[PDB]
Amino acid sequence: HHHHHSSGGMKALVYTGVAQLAFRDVPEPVPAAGDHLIRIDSVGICGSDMHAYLGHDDRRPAPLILGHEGAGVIIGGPRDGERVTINPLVTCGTCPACVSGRDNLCATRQIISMPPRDGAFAQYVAMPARNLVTVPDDVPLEKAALAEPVAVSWHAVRLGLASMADARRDSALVIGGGAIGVAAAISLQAQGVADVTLVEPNAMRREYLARDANYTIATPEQVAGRVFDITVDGVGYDATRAAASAATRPGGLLLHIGLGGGSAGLDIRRITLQEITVIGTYTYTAQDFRDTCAAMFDGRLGGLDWTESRPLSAGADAFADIRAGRVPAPKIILKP
Amino acid sequence: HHHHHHSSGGMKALVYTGVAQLAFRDVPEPVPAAGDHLIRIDSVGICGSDMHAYLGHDDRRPAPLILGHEGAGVIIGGPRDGERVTINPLVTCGTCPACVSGRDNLCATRQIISMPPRDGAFAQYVAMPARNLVTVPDDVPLEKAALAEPVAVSWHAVRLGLASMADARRDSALVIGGGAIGVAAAISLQAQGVADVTLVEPNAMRREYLARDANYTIATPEQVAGRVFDITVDGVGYDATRAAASAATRPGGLLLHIGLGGGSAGLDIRRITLQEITVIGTYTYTAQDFRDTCAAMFDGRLGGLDWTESRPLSAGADAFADIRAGRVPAPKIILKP
Ligand SMILES: [Zn+2]
Ligand SMILES: [Zn+2]
Ligand SMILES: [Zn+2]
Ligand SMILES: [Zn+2]
Ligand SMILES: [Zn+2]
Question: How far is the centre of ligand 4, averaged over its atoms, from the C-alpha of A99 (Å)?
Fold first, then answer.
């Protein structure tokens, strides 16, 4: 088998200062004991990358490689040339959270792009075998790199549905036209809730999404005063929490994924007098990641185009375009 | 030959006439509608919603109003004359989607006794539908059976919460509040198989009263500071209690919110998110929960249910004064019409 016994450099987009991304040479990673070297084909930009880029992220400082939405090809060893998409969350397998099958809550949970783990905004990453899912030949690595953002919302929806105190699952309202919102919308339709409305103020993304949206797309005003069995706040501001509160039917589900900001917004009185199940969600179980990949690859989660690509060398420029709010697509995929 | 009230004069009721004004006066006897019973009230508990209305804080409860919704008593007239009953005060339609779903506590046209248009049970008599009445066996005092409604509130929350949890880890529970809603949560948790229950109450007089018959741990907030529990129950429902329940809930655990203190913040939203806490606000009880509560009360699964002191209805105004002045060691006063 071909090996990397000696290494040189690889290209990476490194976060060097607030709103500053430099495309430069960094050392190629050394795989640990039971780890594979992944040549990154596609790595998507996430709300956590944006948050760390604007200097808002407390835990992600200094020089740092961001990005945790990676798909690519194993280099060297008996799985050389194998096409895989990466689960970036590494879990201890032995804490109470893991043993009940809620590894998303592991006490020592690490993600790629979260020190001490470098991010996937680079030509190569080192990853344990158990964090890799094989991508069939008929699925582009560019669609497979959506595994992680889809898996966040898939986890929310599965856990939410299973947590509901009744079987009345007719209506869902997803708040936010970002990647989280779309993932929630397509997860809700794949998991058997057909009547899904996504609500988004931005006319541009409404048109983008309406291309191949199997679910209803609307503006806040077209759903004013309506109530739904299920609400998904994919944005997570006070305003969006307030909106989700008002739009959840009595006995209904309010899923809170987005991490916008604020410590309020929930109508405590409505949630008590109308008995609303409110569930905050974090990432996904390893089994959710695998289920998500399975549902993508067999076509249950729609066309998965809601993407535009850019070279890693143009990463910085791509961040500016999201900031200025001029990306019609809800996801930018970088190409090392 | 069944006894009847074909003619009626007045009865005694304790009437909310204005802010902090309770007037023990003559009011009309209620005339039961078609499929309803007249109940002569033996025992009626004072709730937080009564004190809220008495202080002028309730927009839905102005004018002259008879408060109270925690009643037990005797059927008067007809074939059930003399039957001891405890009253489910929440009247539900039985045919709306919530009712058909089995969640009749969320009935779209739900009415509760003490919320207009339905007069409360702070009176010698109430009129209630037969489906809202649970028979009390002679070995259960009406003073203990009048706890059914406040115990059904927490029993319902506990059952809903346990059923809704995302994992089968129910080892430990914190109850915040040594009021009736808190004591009811602690006993309901133990009867539903969470053995390890800690109730937290800052007031020493209340803790001491609760220690008479506590099968759960009674403690100060400081004695549990920094600990996390599978299950937290906010039986108070201020911002401070919502914060304390947020902090004390373990990742993936359950935070039940029952209290109606006030405020619309306190919940640590970013921890509920990052640590995936299931947060459930709860309202009253299903008709089935109320029946289930009564059954467990009557067979002794919910402890001695002796955590009450009683006052004649004629002294209701003094009783309200005592509660307001933090003068009441017991977590429940039962008024005696
Ligand atoms: Zn992501
Ligand atoms: Zn673990
Ligand atoms: Zn009550
Ligand atoms: Zn109904
Ligand atoms: Zn007194």
Answer: 42
